[PDB]
Each structure stands twice: as C-alpha cells, then as structure tokens.
Amino acid sequence: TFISRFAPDQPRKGADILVEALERQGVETVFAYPGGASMEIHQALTRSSSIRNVLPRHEQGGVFAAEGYARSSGKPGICIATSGPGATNLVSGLADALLDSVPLVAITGQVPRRMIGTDAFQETPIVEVTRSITKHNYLVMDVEDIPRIIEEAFFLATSGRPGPVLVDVPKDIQQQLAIPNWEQAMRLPGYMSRMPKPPEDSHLEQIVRLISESKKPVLYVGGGCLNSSDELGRFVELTGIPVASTLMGLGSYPCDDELSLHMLGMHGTVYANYAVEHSDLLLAFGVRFDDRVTGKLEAFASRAKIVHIDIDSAEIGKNKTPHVSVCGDVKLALQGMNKVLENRAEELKLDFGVWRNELNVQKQKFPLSFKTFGEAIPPQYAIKVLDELTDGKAIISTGVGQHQMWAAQFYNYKKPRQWLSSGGLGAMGFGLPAAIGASVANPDAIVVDIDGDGSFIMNVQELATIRVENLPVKVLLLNNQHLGMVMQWEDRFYKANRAHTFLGDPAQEDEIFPNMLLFAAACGIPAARVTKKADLREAIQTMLDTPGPYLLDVICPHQEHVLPMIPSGGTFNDVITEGDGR
Amino acid sequence: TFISRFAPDQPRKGADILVEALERQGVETVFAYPGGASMEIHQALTRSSSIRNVLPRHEQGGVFAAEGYARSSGKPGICIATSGPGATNLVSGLADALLDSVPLVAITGQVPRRMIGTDAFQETPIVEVTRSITKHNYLVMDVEDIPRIIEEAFFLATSGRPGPVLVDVPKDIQQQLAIPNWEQAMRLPGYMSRMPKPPEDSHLEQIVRLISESKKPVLYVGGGCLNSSDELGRFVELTGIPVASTLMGLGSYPCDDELSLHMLGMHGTVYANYAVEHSDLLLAFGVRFDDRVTGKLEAFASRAKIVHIDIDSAEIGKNKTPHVSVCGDVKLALQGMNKVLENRAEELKLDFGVWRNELNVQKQKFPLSFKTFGEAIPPQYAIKVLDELTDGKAIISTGVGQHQMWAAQFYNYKKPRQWLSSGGLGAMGFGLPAAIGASVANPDAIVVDIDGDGSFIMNVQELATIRVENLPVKVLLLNNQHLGMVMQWEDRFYKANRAHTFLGDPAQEDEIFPNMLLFAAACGIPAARVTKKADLREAIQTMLDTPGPYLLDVICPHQEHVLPMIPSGGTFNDVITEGDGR
Numbered sequence A, B: 001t002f003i004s005r006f007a008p009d010q011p012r013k014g015a016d017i018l019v020e021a022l023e024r025q026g027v028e029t030v031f032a033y034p035g036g037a038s039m040e041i042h043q044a045l046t047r048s049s050s051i052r053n054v055l056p057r058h059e060q061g062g063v064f065a066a067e068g069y070a071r072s073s074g075k076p077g078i079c080i081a082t083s084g085p086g087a088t089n090l091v092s093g094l095a096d097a098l099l100d101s102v103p104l105v106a107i108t109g110q111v112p113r114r115m116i117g118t119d120a121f122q123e124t125p126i127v128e129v130t131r132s133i134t135k136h137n138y139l140v141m142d143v144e145d146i147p148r149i150i151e152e153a154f155f156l157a158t159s160g161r162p163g164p165v166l167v168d169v170p171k172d173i174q175q176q177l178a179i180p181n182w183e184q185a186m187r188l189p190g191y192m193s194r195m196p197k198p199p200e201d202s203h204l205e206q207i208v209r210l211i212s213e214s215k216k217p218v219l220y221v222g223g224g225c226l227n228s229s230d231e232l233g234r235f236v237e238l239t240g241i242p243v244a245s246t247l248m249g250l251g252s253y254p255c256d257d258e259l260s261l262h263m264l265g266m267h268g269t270v271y272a273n274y275a276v277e278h279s280d281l282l283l284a285f286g287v288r289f290d291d292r293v294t295g296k297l298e299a300f301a302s303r304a305k306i307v308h309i310d311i312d313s314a315e316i317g318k319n320k321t322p323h324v325s326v327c328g329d330v331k332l333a334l335q336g337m338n339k340v341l342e343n344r345a346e347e348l349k350l351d352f353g354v355w356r357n358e359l360n361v362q363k364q365k366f367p368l369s370f371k372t373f374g375e376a377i378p379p380q381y382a383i384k385v386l387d388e389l390t391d392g393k394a395i396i397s398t399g400v401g402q403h404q405m406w407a408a409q410f411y412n413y414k415k416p417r418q419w420l421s422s423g424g425l426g427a428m429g430f431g432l433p434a435a436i437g438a439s440v441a442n443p444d445a446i447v448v449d450i451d452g453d454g455s456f457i458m459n460v461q462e463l464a465t466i467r468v469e470n471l472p473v474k475v476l477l478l479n480n481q482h483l484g485m486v487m488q489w490e491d492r493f494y495k496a497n498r499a500h501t502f503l504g505d506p507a508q509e510d511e512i513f514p515n516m517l518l519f520a521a522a523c524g525i526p527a528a529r530v531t532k533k534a535d536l537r538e539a540i541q542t543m544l545d546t547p548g549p550y551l552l553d554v555i556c557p558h559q560e561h562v563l564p565m566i567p568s569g570g571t572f573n574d575v576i577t578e579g580d581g582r
C-alpha cells in the first residue's frame, strides 16, 4: 500500500505527480542533470524521500549510468535531462539501449506546449529525433496524462523485449496543478493483445523430440537468457548439450564450466564456432543471429536443424530461417522442456559424450592463447589476474574495442548481469558511467570498469561523479595508446597504414599520453600505473583492497591482436588464428 | 441549452456519444455511407431526431456533397465513411477541401484498436494516408476522448484558415459504453496562441495612406473574402478602386457592377490582367498568389506596392513578396479601414476616375467574346441565358474544364457562395454531388450544376441520390463530346494531335455518346436534349419551371476555346485573345 506525500484531494504540480508516478513504480534511483525546462522536476525530486538522484557530469553519462543500473539489476534505469542540448545528449544511450534490449525510461523536459514548433529557446523535437531509436516515446500534452503515460512507459520498457521509452514533458505541464488519478487504465490494446502466450506443450514436445534424434546438438544462448540462469542450468544437466554464448549472453551459463564452449562469433573461440559449424541441432535461445555471430548467413550452421525461441516474433526468421520456432519467454520454454526431459529421462536416454569429446579435442588443439613479451604486460593476462583476485564475482563493465573482447574472453562470469558491455551499437565511453550505475544498484559488489584509453577519455568527466557519490568503482585501464580495434584492422587489411588511430602525443612519442593518473587525481581518486608484468598482480590487489574508487593504468604493448578472428561476412574456414601487429 | 436523449449519468455507446457530439455542434445534415466498421455510428444516427443523413451512392459523392454543403452555407460539411475502401474513397475530397480552404469534418470507421497494424479486414492506415491532405486528423484511442476530439475537429475545421479534419474511430470505441464529459477543455494551446489578433490601427492607417498616395490601385480579392461581402462593398464605395477577383473569390464583389473587372489570371479578362499589370497599388485581400493568377511571378504586378492581408501567416510572402502585410481576418481589416476612410473622407479626397477610365477603355476594346456558328449552341451563350432566366440568383456548381471557365466568365454572381467550383485541386466530378449538398443546405434556392460530359459521368451515380432525396437539382450539361480543356491544349501546343480526349463512340462518330438522357431516365429524373440555338431559351426555361430535378443535355461544338488565355508561366504580353480548334 503506497503512501503519498499529498492528500488524495490535494492539487500538486505536474512535476510532483511525475515524481510520485516514479515512486509508485518502485523507482529508488534516477540519473538527472538539471536545466531550465526540467527545473520543476528537479525541485520535486528534492521533495521525495525515497528517490535519490545521482548527478552526472554529462547527460550521456546519465543515460549510460541508467543502462549500467538496468543491465546489472534487471530493473529499469531512469535518466532525466532538460530540453534541447540535454535531450540530444541522451541519444547515443537511447540507441544503445534499443539495440541491446535494455529496459530504460528517459524523461526530458520540454519547452511550454504553446512554444512547440516555434524554434523556441532550447527546443529540440526530441520525440521526432528519437522515434527510430526508442521502443516507444511520448509527448505529454496534458497534466492529466502523467500517471497513465509513466505507467505505460515502465510497462513497455520492461515487458516483452525490453527497451528504452522516452517521455517528453513540457514545462507548463510540470507547473500545472492537478489531482492525479492513479487508477487510469493503460491504452495499449494492440501491444497487450500481441504479447506472447505461455509456450504450448505441442511446440515443447517437438523440441525435446528433436534433441533425442540429434547427435551434434549445440546450445546458442544470448541476451534473452539473462533471467533464465537456473532454468538453462537445469536444462544442460538433463541434456548434456554444450553451451555457446553470444557477447550479450555471457554468464547465463557459467564460463568456468565443463560444458561451456564460451563465446562464438567473429572473435569467438575456435571450438565454439566449430561446434555450430558442424552441429545438426542448433538450439538458439534468446538470440538474434546478428552478423558478428553468423558471418555469412548461408554458411552459418549450414547442416543443422535450427530451433529459435524468441520473445519477439519479428526476430524469428529475420536473418536465419528456422525449422522449429517458439515465440515466447525462453524462461517458460526451458521450464516446460525441463519437465518433459525429467519425466522421460529413462525413456529418452540422452548421451552426447561422442559429440562432447569431438569438441573437447578442438578445445585442446585450439584454445584461447596469448603471448608474453619480456616484462611487458599482456592485456589478456591482466584480465585473468583480475578474474583470479576477484574470484570471478566482480561486476565488469567495458568500453568498446580490443579490451572489450579480452574482457569477454578472459574473465569467467559465473552469473548473468556481471557482464555489462555495449554489443549492438558498440558505443565507446560506456564503461565508466555504466560502472557508476552498476555500483549504485549493487553497492556491496566489486565493480570494475575494464576500459580502453580511447573509450575511457570520452566520458572521463564522470570521475567527478564517482568521487562525489563515493562509489567504490575500480578502473582497470588497458592502455595501448591506440584506438586498438581500428588499429588491428589497419594491420590486417590496410598494410598497417595508420589513419588517426594513435591517441598519444607524436611530439613525445614514447610518453604515455594523456596521463590518466592526473585525471583521477583531479577528482580525488587514488591511482597508480603498472608497466612490468611482475608488478601487475600486486597492483591489481592494491586496487581491490584500497577502499573506494581506484584507477589502475595498465600499460600494454599496442601490437596485440584480438584472436581468433573470422573476417566480416566470412565462414569458419576463414578464421584467423595467428598474427599480430609485429 | 442542449437537450440530450440520454440521462447525464446514463452510459451509452461511443457511437451515441459521437452523434450527440455532432448535435451539440449544431450539425443537422451528414453524408454517410455505411459499412462494417461504421455500422454503430449509423445505428446511432437513426436514433437522432435532429440529424438527417443523405446517403450518397459513392463516398467521393459523399465528401463532395459535404463540400457543396459547406461552400454554399459557411457551415462545416460532415461526411462519414466506413474503414478501408470507404475511407480511401474520401481522399480526393479531403485534398480538394484543403487546397480550397473548405471547412469539413470527415469521420471514418476503423477496425478495432487491437487489430490496428495487423492488415485486418478492410484496414487502411487512413490517418497516415491523409496527414498531408488534411488540416489535421485524429485516431481516437479511447471512448473518453470523443467529446474533446469532435469539438477540436469542428474548431480546427472552421477557425483560422478553414480546412478538412478527419477523425478515425475504431469500431470497439463505438461500442464501448461510457458517460461523456462535455466540459473537457480543448488541447490546442499552440494553435490557439498563434491565432491572428484583430488588426492594429498601426497597420490599417498605413494602408489607407498608401491608397491616397497611389494613382492606379487595383483590388485583388479571393476566397478569403467570402464572409466580407458587405465590408468589401463599403470599402469600394469609399475608395472607388476597381475589383479584380480570383476564381475562388467570384461574387464577393458583384460581377454585374460598374467597378467589377471580373476574373483575373490565366483565363481572366484582358482588362483585369491589364489593371494588375500596370497597377501601382495591389490590394491583395484573401488571396494566395497561385500560379494560375500570377503566371511568371517576377512579372506579376511588377510596378505595384503590394498589400497582402491574409489570415494564414504562412501565405504572406510565400510566392510574391509584399511591401505591407497584415496577418488577420480581412473582414476586420476592412471594417477598420472603412472607419478611417469614412472619417478622413473630405481630407483624403480619393478619386481614381482617371485610372478607372483607362481601364474602361480596355474593357470596351477587349471584352469577353464568343462566336455563333449557324444554329449551333455557343456554350458561353447558354450560360448567359441561364444567368438571365435565373436573374443571377442561382447557386452554381461546376465540374472542371472549359465549361467551368465559361461558367465563371459568363454568369454574374451577385453574392459569394453562389459559386461552388473546385479551383486548387480542380477535381472533375465535383459538380453533381456539390449541387446535392448545396440544395440540402439551401432547399429554397435555384441550384444548377453546370457540368461537362467528362466530369458529369464520373459521379453520375449521384443521380440516384438526387431522386431519392427529391432535391430540385438542375443539370446544365455542356456536352462537347470531349475532355475539352485538355483538347484545347492539344490544339494550341500539340498540333491538335488527339491523345485520348474524345469521349464518344468512334464506331458511331457523329452520335452523341453516351446518351445522358437515359442516365437521368434510369434514376427517374426528367431530361431533354437541345441542339439548335433557337430552342435553347425555352429548354432552359422548361428545366427551371419543371419542379424537382432536371437534366438538360446542351450539345455544343467541340472546337470552342476558352479565351483569353495567358500560357502557363507567361506574362500579360503573352495573352492569347483569338483562335479555336477550327
């Protein structure tokens, strides 16, 4: 039973109605940066005792923190910005949340309703700008609609395939006095009538049947399984099917497990891509068959019966055409299939030990490998040490690039929502603000931003946020002085011709530039640099043991390449397994 | 004080709420064609005792009748159609009403809300289709919004620059029971804050000043003056400025008046186009400077100070850049200027008799002329006889083409809203259904559809409507067996090479085809054909004296050309004054 701060017959500002609408959704944290068009909302936030605001230093930091909050908790992330330049600073995070299916509610202040369309001060038609990069958006045109629209926004953001919803609120609506009606029904008849139903036994029986008739089955799990950790684990016990995971699915099935093929795709392991290449049954659970994973679509799982379980009917058959399809929640499909598998256990007699042994041969012939040069620090090794010293229990956020791939390859995530990374859009600058949101959502967890030097500097201003909010955010900065992933493609395909990928100072070519330690010092954050591989273990331990925030500048040789690599649009026969920039 | 047919606490269907919403707007006549998605609305219409439905035989006839109703009365015309093929049949009339600024409210049934977007039975996304050809449109998503949206539709259609508004009503909303709230405020804050204010004396004084300083002033009046007949007439008394009128403005100033220059433009009189060509002050009242009137914009009124009074700020300076501009209702501007002119009468001493005499010389050297060949009926002469026998008091609707021009040139409209013609879009088939709407709105008036044989056959099915509704609609069919206006351009610019402009039967080339008398006979409408000019006067008199509907098939030589003609994009020096298809 909710307790309002206003009498049921007492008129309050629309901004107070909006804040209470957030309170009634269970919101405890927002990421709000004030401006003229949203001042009323910020005043109403100070009047709330249950909602805390984390003031970022850039609205892109605000939306990315809301993402990290959401990705690490399963709850919707809430960011708030003013009109115009505040709203446009949210755009990268909105697109990021849509491509990765992250539940997000973004609220933007807007000019007064009568000023809309007149090129008013700090006016941006943000509803038009963001229509194609949000799951849905709204322009509130009356204070009476605030309870309903906020409720619909949270429902749309969190139900079905999750995504971002933007709510544009004109300033005059924030000031207008009204008595809210919290009993209004939502106006989503089409959306609600097309929400997937529980999976029928008809479809679930056929899948278990295809499993018993197959000899080379491969699980292909992705971001849709983040809430099915227990069900997927039980499913693997009952079937013994090896698990290949996408970038977004990492941790749904434990990485340090015997049946784990780890990541597949462009930078997936040789044995995971091998398994899919030669499988006869592909169980595609919570995946969208993106080009990083499949390469050439015609060659992807070319001799496999493809079972695709997805909550979005539009994804089924979008790129790869399945044989069997189930449109529904993969959590429920796993539960139904687990019952059938448990009952018919002695009848089915499932044993894929011959297939698993064929894969474990590839696993030992072509494992993930890295080279140690003198006393230089291998980035892959630094992440393995972090995994060891944190016991694989840390929440990991990343930027985008080589360090992102190494953070995916060389850390054994035991649970979903430890892995917070921008996969579909791949937005640099995500790692630091995402760690802010993850730490606020999980204040007792070890939170480490494994960042690159290009990605880290893009939103370096959020170090001030970390200090002011006294968040124990650790930064493991893999510093190669380059835009590494673009540098790698220069080496492979452009004869190592450098086109603006060096991030240091060419006048002092052998100096680490910039000095990231002084960025941390500017914000009162203790920091250190490590260069010798012998010193790396104690340096990471110091970062972990030092209470509060900490930045560890880990210098790495830039000639490292992420391996293996299947070229874009290629097949398994095109996989690159050796070579670097030396 | 309105009297509802339901108790204020009694729930009724949304369809009954919609019909009462029409009743509360003063609606007495709708033009509604039933279908599955609008059956509920039609059931609710039979329960209304104050609203009469005129069932057309085609929804295009329905919307064009709503136009004729509106154009002839100043009230909004209301048409109703079912979803899908009913809605798409409204499209030509919606575009027609937008280009001519006709107040119109179109209501379309729609599939149930949950079916929208699923390619349901008879589903058309009519709101998307018609967004660019309506002033505004709505998709009603809750039964509670019906009172507000209907009120906003009528307000938007009739206020400012009038235009069509479409309201799309899903079938489930028509069936849902609710208690309407008729006190809801409209949500048009931007539109209402930008509605033009009464004209300031600052701007009105400057215009009267420019009048006293000019020696060759020309009034240039259009469709925006249809409600300023008295004010414009008083303005002409106080200034003695000659009046040139657009196609849409005909009748605002009486045609059979001494100061009337009649129509200007592509087929305007030589003296009207002369006056504008050599004017030093152009009073552009309620006009939009379209290409038919101006020709080459740089040459149009090239040596004139241009005063443009328009209620739409977007029209001021759109094609021609004025010197002085007033954004407001021309009715109020005329009233304000009339006060100034009346007070400073002896001070201003306005006399343009020198300019008027220079124009009356052109008026006598180059008047409107037509040629009589043997006993063949000149179409121009037929319209002059109709003018005489009706004493210039008939409501005239037309199709589009040569007959439309002759109906504009050779009938002296004494008041606005006697002239109902499609000017901006120029849609053939307008004349017959427009006469239906004009007769329903003016049941004691003489209503004559001056139609062409191509235009008349397009909506010939509305003859059944005329008989069933027992409307005294007269049809003066100027039958030249051709698509005359396109034929004229073939003669002038394509060496008379015929490209599908002959409407008769080439097997029986000298037979009148089709036999329009049998179309009228099929619908129990008395009819006659006249071919000899000597018989024309009695035939028209018989048409007028015979009570009820009547069709007069007036056979005309097809080689007639509308004269004069300024070629498209030409100047006054390019005017064509002689020649035909002989």
Ligand SMILES: Cc1cc2nc3c(=O)[nH]c(=O)nc-3n(C[C@H](O)[C@H](O)[C@H](O)COP(=O)(O)OP(=O)(O)OC[C@H]3O[C@@H](n4cnc5c(N)ncnc54)[C@H](O)[C@@H]3O)c2cc1C
Binding pocket: A099, A100, A101, A160, A161, A162, A221, A222, A223, A224, A225, A245, A246, A247, A248, A249, A263, A264, A265, A266, A267, A268, A285, A286, A287, A288, A289, A290, A292, A293, A309, A310, A311, A312, A315, A328, A329, A330, A331, A400, A401, A404, A422, A423, A424, A425, A426, A427, A485
């Ligand atoms: C530099 C870089 C390199 C990359 N290389 C790789 C790579 O080598 N390998 C790799 O895997 N990725 C790689 N990616 C990531 C990549 O581009 C995509 O983000 C990722 O492959 C897609 O993950 P997904 O298939 O699990 O679909 P997601 O983006 O996670 O979407 C989830 C899918 O499951 C469905 N779903 C959601 N919820 C449910 C539910 N409850 N039940 C059923 N279905 C549900 C959704 O409708 C959607 O179809 C890389 C990214 C970057 C930036």
Ligand SMILES: Cc1cc2nc3c(=O)[nH]c(=O)nc-3n(C[C@H](O)[C@H](O)[C@H](O)COP(=O)(O)OP(=O)(O)OC[C@H]3O[C@@H](n4cnc5c(N)ncnc54)[C@H](O)[C@@H]3O)c2cc1C
Binding pocket: B099, B100, B101, B160, B161, B162, B221, B222, B223, B224, B225, B245, B246, B247, B248, B249, B263, B264, B265, B266, B267, B268, B285, B286, B287, B288, B289, B290, B292, B293, B309, B310, B311, B312, B315, B328, B329, B330, B331, B400, B401, B404, B422, B423, B424, B425, B426, B427, B485
């Ligand atoms: C075959 C054919 C030939 C044609 N040839 C000619 C021709 O030779 N000559 C000719 O004149 N037309 C001709 N037309 C008609 C033509 O294409 C245009 O419809 C017409 O010229 C435009 O009329 P208008 O300038 O009065 O503007 P309208 O279409 O009547 O619009 C009214 C204008 O006044 C403004 N307004 C409305 N209400 C008010 C108010 N209360 N106060 C102030 N302003 C207001 C509106 O914003 C708008 O700018 C022809 C049409 C056809 C089909």
Ligand SMILES: Cc1ncc(C[n+]2c([C@@](C)(O)OO)sc(CCOP(=O)(O)OP(=O)(O)O)c2C)c(N)n1
Binding pocket: A399, A400, A401, A402, A403, A404, A426, A427, A428, A429, A451, A452, A453, A454, A455, A456, A478, A480, A482, A483, A484, A485, A486
């Ligand atoms: C906002 C933004 N701008 C540019 C991008 C294009 N990319 C990349 C890519 C793979 O998306 O190529 O398309 S990765 C990358 C360079 C990463 O520099 P680093 O942070 O130092 O990490 P590393 O360990 O050295 O590799 C660039 C420039 C991007 N994704 N986001």
Ligand SMILES: Cc1ncc(C[n+]2c([C@@](C)(O)OO)sc(CCOP(=O)(O)OP(=O)(O)O)c2C)c(N)n1
Binding pocket: B399, B400, B401, B402, B403, B404, B426, B427, B428, B429, B451, B452, B453, B454, B455, B456, B478, B480, B482, B483, B484, B485, B486
């Ligand atoms: C729905 C529609 N289709 C085609 C049209 C193109 N036009 C015309 C025009 C000027 O708009 O040329 O653009 S006029 C015209 C022929 C008129 O045949 P009539 O009715 O017999 O009259 P008349 O006395 O003989 O001239 C055509 C074909 C049109 N406007 N509407």
Ligand SMILES: COc1nc(C)nc(NC(=O)NS(=O)(=O)c2ccccc2OCCCl)n1
Binding pocket: A035, A036, A037, A083, A110, A111, A112, A115, A120, A121, A122, A171, A172
């Ligand atoms: C320096 O100007 C300033 N500074 C600050 C800190 N606040 C405000 N607020 C404000 O202008 N409110 S407003 O009247 O409703 C308003 C009117 C018109 C257009 C926009 C608009 O607001 C939306 C953007 Cl501020 N203005």
Ligand SMILES: COc1nc(C)nc(NC(=O)NS(=O)(=O)c2ccccc2OCCCl)n1
Binding pocket: B035, B036, B037, B083, B110, B111, B112, B115, B120, B121, B122, B171, B172
């Ligand atoms: C021959 O079928 C028929 N005939 C007639 C005369 N009426 C109806 N009515 C009807 O189908 N109503 S509906 O259930 O709500 C409905 C459901 C789905 C899609 C559309 C739809 O209606 C909108 C278009 Cl009819 N159907």
Ligand SMILES: [Mg+2]
Binding pocket: A372, A381
């Ligand atoms: Mg080592």
Ligand SMILES: [Mg+2]
Binding pocket: A401, A452, A453, A454, A478, A479, A480, A481, A482, A483, A484
């Ligand atoms: Mg780098």
Ligand SMILES: [Mg+2]
Binding pocket: B372, B381
């Ligand atoms: Mg004669």
Ligand SMILES: [Mg+2]
Binding pocket: B401, B452, B453, B454, B478, B479, B480, B481, B482, B483, B484
């Ligand atoms: Mg004709």
